[PDB]
Amino acid sequence: KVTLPDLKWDFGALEPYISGQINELHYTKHHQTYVNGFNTAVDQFQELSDLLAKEPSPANARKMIAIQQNIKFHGGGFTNHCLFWENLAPESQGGGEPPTGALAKAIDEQFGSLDELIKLTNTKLAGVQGSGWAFIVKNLSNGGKLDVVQTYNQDTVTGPLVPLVAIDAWEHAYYLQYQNKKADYFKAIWNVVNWKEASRRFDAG
């Protein structure tokens, strides 16, 4: 069912900011595991769905509840990493080039400059006290205003919050290259952020 997104650039294309070693593992092992976990969980839910249709018991309801956590976690892992690769690009393909259009105007109006929004995001990233993510979002419920939000583990942004830029703060995203020095990774990644994709997502809503 759900599959790994097609490889766009080779693993080493984001060097020296993110290593090919990291990208190979992050994609072939970590992302694949969420793919497999999500497929398994949705399958298990379908089986329990049919079981509940036959006997709508509290005991059968309890096993549905047990599987929900795996749908959330692996579903989140699948979606978050898909977003992640799509908002990353080598400098040859426009990575690190500033956003354009309505997103660029919103950034300047709200934060004063790109650098200020980046600074805020880096603060949110360093403030993840465990595994998680930061997302630059467009909030559709308050007039399409920009904000930066943290999530933990593989929690994601849903509903009115549209993800524009996803940044992985899990230790596996940086440890082989940066080790404990996560701030250096958060600083470095903006050199390969695909702001064209972010602008596109701002417009698409």
Give the separation between CA 88 and CA 192, rounded to whole angstroms: 6
Residues 155-184 within binding reach of Mn ion (CB under 5 A): 168, 170
Closest-CA residue to 136 (of 160, 153, 154, 120): 120
Query: Which is nearer to Mn ion, 30 or 200 (by Cβ)?
Result: 30
Residue 74, marked binder: no
Residue 30, marked binder: no
| Least gap, CB of 101 to Mn ion (angstroms) | 29
CA angle, residues 18, 23, 27, in degrees to nearest 5? 150
Chain-centroid distance of CA 42 in Å reads 20
Partnered with residue 29 across adjacent β-strands are none
Dihedral of CA atoms 193, 86, 78, 17 in degrees, nearest 10, equals: -30
Strand boundaries in 45-156, DSSP class E: 132-139, 145-152
Position among 97, 109, 184, 203 found at the interface with a second copy (CB under 8 A): 109
Number of chain positions touching Mn ion (CB under 5 A):
2
Query: Which is nearer to Mn ion, 85 or 170 (by Cβ)?
Result: 170
Enumerate residues 6+ apart whose C-beta is below 8 A from 87. Answer: 164, 165, 166, 193, 194, 197, 198, 201
Residue 179 amino acid letter:
Q
Residues 119-158 within binding reach of a second copy (CB under 8 A): 120, 129-132, 139, 141-143, 145-148, 152-154, 156, 158
152 binds, options Mn ion, a second copy, none, Cβ within 5 to 8 A by partner type: a second copy
| Least gap, CB of 27 to a second copy (angstroms) | 11
What 3-state DSSP class applies to 49? Answer: helix
| Least gap, CB of 165 to a second copy (angstroms) | 14
Bind-site residues for Mn(2+): 26, 81, 168, 172
User: Where along the sequence are the contacts to a second copy (CB under 8 A)?
Assistant: 1-3, 5, 25, 29-30, 33, 38, 42, 45-46, 49, 52-53, 56, 58, 61-66, 68-69, 71-73, 75-76, 78-79, 82-83, 109-111, 120, 129-132, 139, 141-143, 145-148, 152-154, 156, 158-159, 170-172, 175-176, 179-180
